[PDB]
Design a protein around this ligand. Structure first.
Ligand SMILES: [Mg+2]
Ligand SMILES: [Mg+2]
Ligand SMILES: [Mg+2]
Ligand SMILES: [Mg+2]
Ligand SMILES: [Mg+2]
Ligand SMILES: [Mg+2]
Lengths: 131, 262, 185, 58, 441, 70
RNA sequence: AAUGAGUCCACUUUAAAUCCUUUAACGAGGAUCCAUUGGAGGGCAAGUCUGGUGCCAGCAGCCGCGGUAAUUCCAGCUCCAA
RNA sequence: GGUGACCACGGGUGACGGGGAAUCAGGGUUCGAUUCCGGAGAGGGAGCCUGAGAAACGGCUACCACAUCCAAGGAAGGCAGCA
RNA sequence: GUCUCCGUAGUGUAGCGGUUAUCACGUUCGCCUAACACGCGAAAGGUCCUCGGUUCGAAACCGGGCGGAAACACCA
C-alpha cells in the first residue's frame, strides 16, 4: 500500500454508452498484482466517484513485476452501468446472478420438449420425470 | 453452393478494412445496400476499429440500437450496414460528423467535417434513363435514383445531393481540367485533375490524371469520381490532399516527426 | 476453422558435411570464447548473417539509383548500425559483405555484461542473466541472446530486486543468517 | 530347415558379466562445451608425439 | 436409504433351481405375463414346458436346448425393504468352475434341494453336489444363507410333514458339521413348478406354521421367501479399504467399446480416475460405470457393475483379472504366496510338485505346490511338526506354491474377499484354506 | 505372412540373441532392411528386418529395458 | 554466495477455470534435483586399451571384420558427434 | 458434315483445381486430402414437394446393399457435422 | 464359457498295464587337411505337455488343467 500508483492513458469519453474509458497501469515494484478492488477504489478516489461504478478488467503484468496494465471503465450512473456492461462483469461485482442449469441439460430439455406437440401440460411436464 | 452466401471469412475480408488475423475466424459480412461489399465500410468496424467507441460487436450493437448513428441523415440500426464512399456519418449526442473518404493509401480514413458541410453530399451518376410517361431518371453511384434531373446532366458526372431532401442543387460535368478522385484500383485515393481521356469502343475508357505535384497516372473510367469544379474541391479533403507520396519521402517524414516529438 | 496462425520458420541451418576438423574447431573456438550452450546457437547467428549477406548481395545486383535498392539499403544499414555491428561511417552495401559472425556474437547481452564487467567470466554472465539479475533500461531480461542496440548499451545494469543492486538477499544467505542466530544467542 | 538355429545368442551368453564402474556425473550443456573447449584449445604441452589423438592408448 | 445385496442360487441339475427363481422374478415383477407366456409358447414346440420359468435365467439358446444351466446369469428386482440382485448357478459337476465364480461374487446364498424320492438321496451323498456347494459357499465367504426345499408337490403325500422334517434335520446336521448354524439359517418349503409359497402362504398346505430365525443382530420370523429375504443380514462395506474389483467378464458393446463386468469388493469406483489391472499390468482411465443398464455416480462395495474403459481391447484384460486404483496401492502380479489349508479328501498322499487348480474369486489357475513348511492342527492353528513329506485328508498345513500362469492374489489379512480360495481336482474340493503372506514382483 | 494382402516374406532378426524373443504366431513389425527393396550384405534375398515383436521393441528386449508379455 | 525444477498462499487471467507473468513461505554439495541417442578400420570425428568368442555368435548402408594375439563381434574403461 | 501426328479418340492416375509447400547459384525437380477461393458428395443410384434460391438428404418418394423395434399386424433409418 | 482333435529326445515318430527305442537326421568326440571338401566309428539326447486317481504296479485306463489346431455362443 505504501508504493502503489495508478497512471491513466488513452483516456477518452463517449456519450454513446455514457462512459469514460481508458487504459491504466499500476506500479507495484515489489508486490504481487494489485487486486482489482484496490484499483477500483483508488481510481474512484482519482476521478472523484464511488467504487461501485468503476469497472476494470484485463490486467496483464509485464515480465519481472512492477508494471501491470489493464483497461478501466467508468460510468456516469449505476443504472447506465447495469444497462450497458457485460453480464459477467456485473456478476463479478455481484449485480448479476447466473443461477441456471448446464448447457447440456438445457439442450436435453429442449430436445425432449420437441417430442410433445401442442399440449401445454405435457410440454411443461416433459422435463419433470427425467431429472 | 445451393444459394447466396451469408458468411465472410476474416482473412477473405477486404484489405482496406484493416482487420487482423487473430481476433477470430469471421468478418462482418456487410448486408446488402447502396455499395458493394468490396469497397464499403460496415458500421461495426467503423465504430469498433476506427473510432474505438465500442470494444465488441455487442457494444456497437447497443450503440446502434440506441439510435445515435445517422447515415446520410437517416437513422440506421443495421450493425453491418454498408456505409460506402462519402456518406455522412452523423452522431448528434457527441456532436461530430464524419465523411467517409479514402486516404492516400486507399483506405477509408476518419475524416471529420462541420455540420454545414455535412448537410450536403456529392454523388456520381451511373445511369440516366427515361421511364414511363416520358419521365427522365438518374441513378447515382449509390443505389439512389431520382426523377426530373437537369437535362444537361450526362452519364458519370457529379451531382450535389443535399440531405433531408434528396434533390439536386448543382452539378459538375465530366470535363477535362476538373478535379477528380480515383475510387478503385492501384491509384485509389489519389486526388488529381482530369488531363486526358482516351476512349476504346467496346472496352473500358482510360483517363489520365495529374495531381498537384505533377505526378501523372491513369485509370479506368469507372474508377473516377469528379469532386471539384476545375481545381477547387466541393468537399473537404483529408490529410495529405490525396497526394500519394512514395516510401522514400514517407520515411524521412517519419524521421522528422520523431525528431520533433523527441 | 481455427483462428490460429501456424506461421513459423527455422532459425538455423545444419552444415552440409559433418565431421570436418576445421569447421568443428572453429565452431568450438567460438562456443568457448562467447560462452554458448551448443552448436545450434552458433548456426543460428551464422544463418542470420547468411540472410543479411544474401539480401545485401541481391541489392548490390540491383542497379544503382533504383529506388527499391536505395530504400532497402538504407533500411538494412540503419538496422545494422542500430545493432552496432557496423560503424556509423561505413554506410555502404559493400561493407555488409565484409561482416563476420563474431561481430554479431559480440553484441549479445551475455557478452555485453561481461565486457561491462558486471560478471567475472562469460559463463558467469550467462548464469547471472538466466537467474534474473540483469536489467536493460527498466525491463529485466533473462535471455542471453538478447541483442543489445547502441541506445540500450548504456542502460545495462543490475536488477533492483536482485541481491546485487537493491536489498533482499538470497535464500541461502537468509538461511545461513537464521542458522547462525539459532546457534548463537 | 537345416537346423542351425540352436546357437542363437551364444557369445552374448558366454560373455562374462562385468558391472559398470560407478563414476562421477558428467557436466552437460554449456559446462560440457566449456570443458571440452578448455581441454583442446587452452593448453601447452612440452612433450613430443606429433599431435597424438585425444584417445591415446599410451 | 436402500441397501443392495447379492444373492446366489445353488442346487442340483434339474432341481428347479432356475424354475423357482423364474417364479420369484415373475411374482416380484421382473418380467411380465406376456414375456412368460412367450417363454411358454417357445417351450411348447420342443416340449420343455416344465422349464418355461427356467428360461428367464437360462438366457443361452444352448442352455435352452440342453435343458441345463451352463454358465451363471444375473437378474434384478426390488424387494419391499431393499434392493437385491440374483445370480443362478449351473449346479452341475462339469460347470463347478462356472458356478463358483457366481458364488464368489456373492453376499448371500439360497440352497435348493428337490424333496422328491430318488433325488434328495443322490443330492446329498459323496457324489452329491449339495455337500460341495454348501462347502464352497462358506469357503468363498458366504457368511449367511437360506435354504428352500423345492418339489415337495411330487412327494407322496404331496406337501407332507415327515419328509420335510427328515430332510431339514439331515441338512441341518450337515451344515452344523460344516460350520453353519441351523438356528440362523432359515428353512423354507417352496413348490416351484406349481408356484406356491413365495409371496403368500399357500393354503394347499397348512402344516407349516412358519420359521423362526435368531441371530446375533436380532430376531425374525418368516412365512414366505420375501419375508425371509427382507430380514437378511446387511453385509459390511469396506469402503475405506482401497479399491479391488475382480472381473466376472469382459464384453465388447457396440458403440462404447470394452466393458469389464465384475462385483466391487473394496473401495468406491467412480468415473474419473485411472485404474490398473493386476495380472496383465495395464493402466487405463475409467470412462463410465453402470449397474443393470442404469448409470451410477459411484460403485459401492458389493455392487456387481460393468464399467467402461478407454483405449483398450477385449484381449488385453480377460476374466479373473482384478482392477484397482493406481492412486492407492495398485494390485499387481504376485510370484507366489503362503497358504494355510485344510485338506478335505484325497485318495493318495499329497507330495511336493502337486499341481491342482486353485480357484480364487474369479481366477481359476493351476498352481504347483512349491513346498510344504509345516503341518497344522485342525483348530487354534497349533504347531505339530516342521517339514512335512506327505499329507492326507482331514489335515491342515502351511504350503508355499507358485501358479503356473500369471495370477494376482491378496492375503486374507489384508483383503478378506480375495484371501479366500478353494482347490479343485477329480470333481471334489480337495483343499480349502486362506492366504497369509504374498510376495510382490 | 503379412496381415494385409497375405504375402509371405523373410525378415532378418538384427542382433545377437533376439531370435530367442521370437516365437511362433507372433505379431511382428517389419521394416525395410536398408536400401529400398535390395538385399543388404551377405544375406541373400532378404529385404526386411524385424523392429518390434508382440508390440514390444526388439531394441528394448535386447537391452533388457522391458520384458516379454507373459 | 545466486537461482530455478518442484511444494504452495494470494493476486491476476478467464463466461468460469487452466496456463503464463507477478508475489508470500519452504525448496541444492555425489547441488543422488544423475541427459540421452548413436559411434570409435576407412568414407567420417573418435582406441593399433583390456577380458571373452573363435568364419561360431554376430557386425557390416559400401568396402569389408570374425577360422584361438579381432583397431570392426559380446562387454568394461576411455574418447567422438548432436 | 465435325475432330485428328500441332497427338484426336481411347486407356491409366496411388488426379478434386488453384492460391501455395519442400529443395534452393541460375535453370529446374517433386508435393499441394489439409483451415483461403472455386467444384463435387452425403451408403449407391434415380425422381420430386416447398421455396427467391435445393434435384436439399440433421426434407420427402421408390429400388439396391446394410441395418433397428415388433405383441410378427406393422413402424422407424443414414455421424465424408461435434465428441 | 462349451465342444472336437493333438501333444514321446530338437525336428519325424515305434511303443506292451510289467522294455523311452531305432531311424533321416540334429549335437559332440576321435577320424585327414594351414583352412577346408568328401569320408570312417561311438556317446549323450525322455517326469512319454503337466498334475493326479485306478492298480501290486500306468506314459499309455481314467479325471482335470496347460499350449496349439477347429467350431459354437457370449451386447453394461
Ligand atoms: Mg567397442
Ligand atoms: Mg480420387
Ligand atoms: Mg486442394
Ligand atoms: Mg472448400
Ligand atoms: Mg449436393
Ligand atoms: Mg439427395
Amino acid at each position: 500500500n505504501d508504493t502503489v500508483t495508478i497512471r491513466t492513458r488513452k483516456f477518452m469519453t463517449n456519450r454513446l454508452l455514457q462512459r469514460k474509458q481508458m487504459v491504466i497501469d499500476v506500479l507495484h515494484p515489489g508486490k504481487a498484482t494489485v487486486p482489482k478492488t484496490e484499483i477500483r477504489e483508488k481510481l474512484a478516489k482519482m476521478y472523484k466517484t464511488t467504487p461501485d461504478v468503476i469497472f476494470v478488467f484485463g490486467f496483464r503484468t509485464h515480465f519481472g513485476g512492477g508494471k501491470t496494465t489493464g483497461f478501466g471503465m467508468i460510468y456516469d450512473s449505476l443504472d447506465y452501468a447495469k444497462k450497458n456492461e457485460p453480464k459477467h462483469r456485473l456478476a463479478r461485482h455481484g449485480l448479476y446472478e447466473k443461477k441456471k442449469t448446464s448447457r447440456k441439460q438445457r439442450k436435453e430439455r429442449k430436445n425432449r420438449m420437441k417430442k410433445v406437440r401442442g399440449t401445454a401440460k405435457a410440454n411443461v411436464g416433459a422435463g419433470k420425470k427425467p431429472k | 453452393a445451393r444459394g447466396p452466401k451469408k458468411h465472410l471469412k476474416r482473412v477473405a475480408a477486404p484489405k482496406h478494412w484493416m482487420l487482423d488475423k487473430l481476433t477470430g475466424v469471421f468478418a462482418p459480412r456487410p448486408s446488402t445496400g447502396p455499395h458493394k461489399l468490396r469497397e464499403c465500410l460496415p458500421l461495426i468496424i467503423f465504430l469498433r476499429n476506427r473510432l474505438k467507441y465500442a470494444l465488441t460487436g455487442d457494444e456497437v450493437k447497443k450503440i446502434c440500437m440506441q439510435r445515435f448513428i445517422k447515415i446520410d441523415g437517416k437513422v440506421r440500426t443495421d450493425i453491418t450496414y454498408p456505409a460506402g464512399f462519402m456518406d455522412v456519418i452523423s452522431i448528434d449526442k457527441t456532436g461530430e460528423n464524419f465523411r467517409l473518404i479514402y486516404d492516400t493509401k486507399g483506405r477509408f480514413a476518419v475524416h471529420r467535417i462541420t455540420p454545414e458541410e455535412a448537410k450536403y453530399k456529392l454523388c456520381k451518376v451511373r445511369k440516366i434513363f427515361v421511364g414511363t410517361k416520358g419521365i427522365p431518371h438518374l441513378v447515382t453511384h449509390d443505389a439512389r435514383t431520382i426523377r426530373y434531373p437537369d437535362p444537361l446532366i450526362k452519364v458519370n458526372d457529379t451531382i450535389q445531393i443535399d440531405l433531408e431532401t434528396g434533390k439536386i442543387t448543382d452539378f459538375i460535368k465530366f470535363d477535362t481540367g476538373n478535379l477528380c478522385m480515383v475510387t478503385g484500383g492501384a491509384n485509389l485515393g489519389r486526388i488529381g485533375v482530369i488531363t486526358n481521356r482516351e476512349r476504346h469502343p467496346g472496352s473500358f475508357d482510360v483517363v489520365h490524371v495529374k495531381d498537384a505535384n505533377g505526378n501523372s497516372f491513369a485509370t479506368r473510367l469507372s474508377n473516377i469520381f469528379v469532386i471539384g469544379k476545375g481545381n477547387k474541391p466541393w468537399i473537404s479533403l483529408p490529410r495529405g490532399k490525396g497526394i500519394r507520396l512514395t516510401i522514400a519521402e514517407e520515411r524521412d517524414k517519419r524521421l522528422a516527426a520523431k525528431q520533433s516529438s523527441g | 476453422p481455427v483462428a490460429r496462425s501456424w506461421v513459423c520458420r527455422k532459425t538455423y541451418v545444419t552444415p552440409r558435411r559433418p565431421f570436418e576438423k576445421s569447421r568443428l574447431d572453429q565452431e568450438l573456438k567460438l562456443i568457448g570464447e562467447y560462452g554458448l550452450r551448443n552448436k545450434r546457437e552458433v548456426w543460428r547467428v551464422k544463418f542470420t548473417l547468411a540472410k543479411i549477406r544474401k539480401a545485401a548481395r541481391e541489392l548490390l545486383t540491383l542497379d544503382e539509383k533504383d529506388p527499391r535498392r536505395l530504400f532497402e539499403g538504407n533500411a538494412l544499414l540503419r538496422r545494422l548500425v542500430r545493432i552496432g555491428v557496423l560503424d556509423e561511417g561505413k554506410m555502404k552495401l559493400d561493407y555488409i559483405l565484409g561482416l563476420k559472425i563474431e561481430d554479431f556474437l559480440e553484441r549479445r547481452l551475455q557478452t555485453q555484461v561481461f565486457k561491462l564487467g558486471l560478471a567475472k567470466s562469460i559463463h558467469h554472465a550467462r548464469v547471472l542473466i538466466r537467474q534474473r539479475h540483469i536489467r536493460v533500461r527498466k525491463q529485466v531480461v533473462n535471455i542471453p541472446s538478447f541483442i543489445v542496440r547502441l541506445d540500450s548499451q548504456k542502460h545495462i545494469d543490475f536488477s533492483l530486486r536482485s541481491p546485487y543492486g537493491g536489498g533482499r538477499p538470497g535464500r541461502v544467505k537468509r538461511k545461513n543468517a537464521k542458522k547462525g542466530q539459532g546457534g548463537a544467542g | 530347415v537345416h537346423g542351425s538355429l540352436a546357437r542363437a545368442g551364444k557369445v552374448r551368453g558366454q560373455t562374462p558379466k562385468v558391472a559398470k564402474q560407478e563414476k562421477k556425473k558428467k557436466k552437460t550443456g554449456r559446462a560440457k562445451r566449456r570443458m571440452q573447449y578448455n581441454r583442446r584449445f587452452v593448453n601447452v604441452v612440452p612433450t613430443f608425439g606429433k599431435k597424438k589423438g585425444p584417445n591415446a592408448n599410451s | 436409504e436402500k441397501t443392495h445385496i447379492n444373492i446366489v442360487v445353488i442346487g442340483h441339475v434339474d432341481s428347479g433351481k432356475s424354475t423357482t427363481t423364474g417364479h420369484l422374478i415373475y411374482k416380484c415383477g421382473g418380467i411380465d405375463k406376456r414375456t412368460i407366456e412367450k417363454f411358454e409358447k417357445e417351450a411348447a414346440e420342443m416340449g420343455k414346458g416344465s422349464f418355461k420359468y427356467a428360461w428367464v435365467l437360462d438366457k443361452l439358446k444352448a442352455e435352452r436346448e440342453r435343458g441345463i444351466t451352463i454358465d451363471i446369469s444375473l437378474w434384478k428386482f426390488e424387494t419391499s425393504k431393499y434392493y437385491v440382485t440374483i445370480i443362478d448357478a449351473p449346479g452341475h459337476r462339469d460347470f463347478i468352475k462356472n458356478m463358483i465364480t457366481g458364488t464368489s461374487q456373492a453376499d448371500c446364498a439360497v440352497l435348493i434341494v428337490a424333496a422328491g424320492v430318488g433325488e434328495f438321496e443322490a443330492g446329498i451323498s459323496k457324489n452329491g453336489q449339495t455337500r460341495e456347494h454348501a462347502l464352497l459357499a462358506y469357503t468363498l465367504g458366504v457368511k449367511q444363507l437360506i435354504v428352500g426345499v423345492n418339489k415337495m408337490d411330487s412327494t407322496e403325500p404331496p406337501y407332507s410333514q415327515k419328509r420335510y422334517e427328515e430332510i431339514v434335520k439331515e441338512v441341518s446336521t450337515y451344515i452344523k458339521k460344516i460350520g453353519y448354524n441351523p438356528d440362523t439359517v432359515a428353512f423354507v418349503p417352496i413348490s416351484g413348478w406349481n408356484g406356491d409359497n413365495m409371496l403368500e402362504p399357500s393354503a394347499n398346505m397348512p402344516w407349516f406354521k412358519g420359521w423362526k430365525v435368531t441371530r446375533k443382530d436380532g430376531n425374525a420370523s418368516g412365512t414366505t421367501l420375501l419375508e425371509a429375504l427382507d430380514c437378511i443380514l446387511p453385509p459390511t462395506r469396506p469402503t475405506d479399504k482401497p479399491l479391488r474389483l475382480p472381473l466376472q467378464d469382459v464384453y465388447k458393446i457396440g458403440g462404447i467399446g470394452t466393458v469389464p463386468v465384475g462385483r466391487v469388493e473394496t473401495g468406491v469406483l467412480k468415473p474419473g480416475m485411472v485404474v490398473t489391472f493386476a495380472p496383465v499390468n495395464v493402466t487405463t482411465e475409467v470412462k463410465s460405470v453402470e449397474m443393470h443398464h442404469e448409470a451410477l455416480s459411484e460403485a459401492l462395495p458389493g455392487d456387481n457393475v460393468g464399467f467402461n474403459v478407454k483405449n483398450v481391447s477385449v484381449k488385453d484384460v480377460r476374466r479373473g483379472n482384478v482392477a484397482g486404483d493406481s492412486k492407492n496401492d495398485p494390485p499387481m502380479e504376485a510370484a507366489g504366496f503362503t497358504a494355510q489349508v485344510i485338506i478335505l479328501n484325497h485318495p493318495g498322499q499329497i507330495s511336493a510338485g502337486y499341481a491342482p487348480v486353485l480357484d480364487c474369486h474369479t481366477a481359476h489357475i493351476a498352481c504347483k505346490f512349491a513346498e510344504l513348511k509345516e503341518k497344522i492342527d485342525r483348530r487354534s492353528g497349533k504347531k505339530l511338526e516342521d517339514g512335512p513329506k506327505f499329507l492326507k485328508s482331514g489335515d491342515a498345513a502351511i504350503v508355499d506354491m507358485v501358479p503356473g500362469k500369471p495370477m494376482c492374489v491378496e492375503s486374507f489379512s489384508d483383503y478378506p474377499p480375495l484371501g479366500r480360495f478353494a482347490v479343485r481336482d477329480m470333481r471334489q474340493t480337495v483343499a480349502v484354506g486362506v492366504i497369509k503372506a504374498v510376495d510382490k514382483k | 505372412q503379412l496381415i494385409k494382402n497375405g504375402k509371405k516374406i523373410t525378415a532378418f532378426v538384427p542382433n545377437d540373441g533376439c531370435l530367442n524373443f521370437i516365437e511362433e504366431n507372433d505379431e511382428v513389425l517389419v521394416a525395410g532392411f536398408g536400401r529400398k527393396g535390395h538385399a543388404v550384405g551377405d544375406i541373400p534375398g532378404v529385404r526386411f528386418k524385424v523392429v518390434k515383436v508382440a508390440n514390444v521393441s526388439l531394441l528394448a528386449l535386447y537391452k533388457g529395458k522391458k520384458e516379454r508379455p507373459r
